[PDB]
Structures are given as structure tokens and as C-alpha cells.
């Protein structure tokens, strides 16, 4: 996160760290949707152009984290994956269309003060909140500049009109994506950056006061560059696939 701020303790009890064993390092962000399900970007696990192909045996999930590099002794829980589910149609070939993956934890995690699931949007929620001008929240432990924080970073970003999103890149944009960030003439800034991927873009419902995951940090050309925006996987759009694998397995 560029132009972000340190999160407060328990600000994002759903934030998950994807961490590889050997060499031990931050892979990506993630989000707890249930006691045994973690949602991330597929590009975190599979990206052939970069020879990236992670099996479950390669990963560890860290929930309830605040410090980036520290082993938060009595706070965080470390989970082993049972099985990873990449959307069968994720397009790593062209534009990261359908950049979503589900990870089944080997054993359910106990909730606490620092570990709590975020809500998945329903049709009316998405309909209400997914509007240009509406700010969402991105959290992560990724680069600070296009340079690594000690603590979870946060920034609030406004959803941008589809046209403006389309017009800011040469990349082929789909319905399974949205963009967010400030416009050059808005005088505020910030964005996600390397290591932020798979992290949640969440909004708080004014109807019921709950936090819903509207998006997933997918991509963007550089970090916080003017006239450029961040692209997020649109969660509602891929909700039935998510529903499909949860109910199936």
C-alpha cells in the first residue's frame, strides 16, 4: 500500500498473510470468509509467465497478524492448506480475468479479537455499494513505493467509473473487475502494490453495519502512478463459483 497508514489493532480481523515455507516470505494478502475458507487472487498461486505455480504443500496461512515479519506469539494462528481451488477460467493468459482462488484450511480456525470473517456480498449489497465515488478499504503488507512496512497498511479508495478504468490502460477489462483510486485532479492518492495481491477491498454497509469483501487486489500498472488505477476482482460476480466450491467440498 502506497500512501497508506498503519492499521489499528483489530481493524481487519479477516486479513490473512500467504507465506511460503522455503524460502520463508510474504507471498500475498488474503481474507477469511469462514472458519476454514480463505479467498485470494489466483495469480498468487498460479502465474505461468513467471513460473509461479504453488501447491498447497508450499503455503502457510497466517491469520490475526499485525506485524509483517514478527511471529505474533499468542495472537496469530498458522494454517496449513488442505486444497486450493483456482477458478477454472482464470485468464492468466491475457488480463487476469477471474483472478480468484479458494483455499481450504486443513483445520478450522477459532475466532477471536484479531480473527473474524468478513461478509461476502449479496445482490442488493453489491448493487448499493459498488458505485463510483464510494470508498472501499484495501489493506496489505506490500510495497510502500513502486519500502516494506512493519505493520499492516490501510488506505480508503473510491470506486472509479468503468469508462475511466478502461481509458487508463491498454489492458482488456472485463465485468469480473473494477478499478479504484483517486484521479489526478483529486489531490489524494494511494494504491496497493506488490505483495498486496489477494488482499481484500471491503466496504462497510450503512444498512447493517457489516463489512463486505467487494473486491480482491488483482493488478495495476505500477503503484500510485497518476492517471492509473488499481484493478480488483469483483467478488459478487464470481459469487456462484465460490458458492459452488464451498457447497461441493
Amino acid at each position: 500500500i502506497v500512501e497508506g497508514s498503519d492499521a489499528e489493532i483489530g481493524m481487519s480481523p479477516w486479513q490473512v498473510m500467504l507465506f511460503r515455507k522455503s524460502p520463508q516470505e510474504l507471498l500475498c494478502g488474503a481474507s477469511l470468509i469462514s472458519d476454514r475458507w480463505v479467498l485470494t487472487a489466483a495469480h498468487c498461486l498460479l502465474y505461468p509467465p513467471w513460473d509461479k505455480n504453488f501447491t498447497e504443500n508450499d503455503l502457510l496461512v497466517r491469520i490475526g497478524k499485525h506485524s509483517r515479519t514478527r511471529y505474533e506469539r499468542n495472537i496469530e494462528k498458522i494454517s496449513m492448506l488442505e486444497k486450493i481451488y483456482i477458478h477454472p477460467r482464470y485468464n492468466w493468459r491475457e488480463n487476469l480475468d477471474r483472478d480468484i482462488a479458494l483455499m481450504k484450511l486443513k483445520k478450522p480456525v477459532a475466532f477471536s479479537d484479531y480473527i473474524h470473517p468478513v461478509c461476502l456480498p449479496d445482490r442488493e449489497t453489491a448493487a448499493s455499494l459498488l458505485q463510483a465515488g464510494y470508498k472501499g478499504r484495501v489493506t496489505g503488507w506490500g510495497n510502500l513505493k513502486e519500502g516494506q512496512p512493519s505493520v499492516l497498511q490501510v488506505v480508503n479508495l473510491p470506486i472509479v467509473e468503468r469508462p475511466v478504468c478502461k481509458d487508463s490502460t491498454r489492458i482488456r477489462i472485463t465485468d469480473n473487475m473494477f478499478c479504484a483510486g483517486y484521479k489526478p485532479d483529486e489531490g489524494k492518492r494511494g494504491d496497493a502494490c506488490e505483495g498486496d495481491s489477494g488482499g481484500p477491498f471491503v466496504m462497510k454497509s450503512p444498512f447493517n453495519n457489516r463489512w463486505y469483501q467487494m473486491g480482491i487486489v488483482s493488478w495495476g500498472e505500477g503503484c500510485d502512478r497518476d492517471g492509473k488505477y488499481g484493478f480488483y476482482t469483483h467478488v459478487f460476480r464470481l459469487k456462484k463459483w465460490i458458492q459452488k466450491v464451498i457447497d461441493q467440498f
Partner: peptide
């Protein structure tokens, strides 16, 4: 790396 070992 900059990482504190995990059990």
C-alpha cells in the same frame, strides 16, 4: 528473510 522464524 526480514522474517522472524515461525515454530
Amino acid at each position: 528473510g526480514d522474517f522472524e522464524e515461525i515454530p
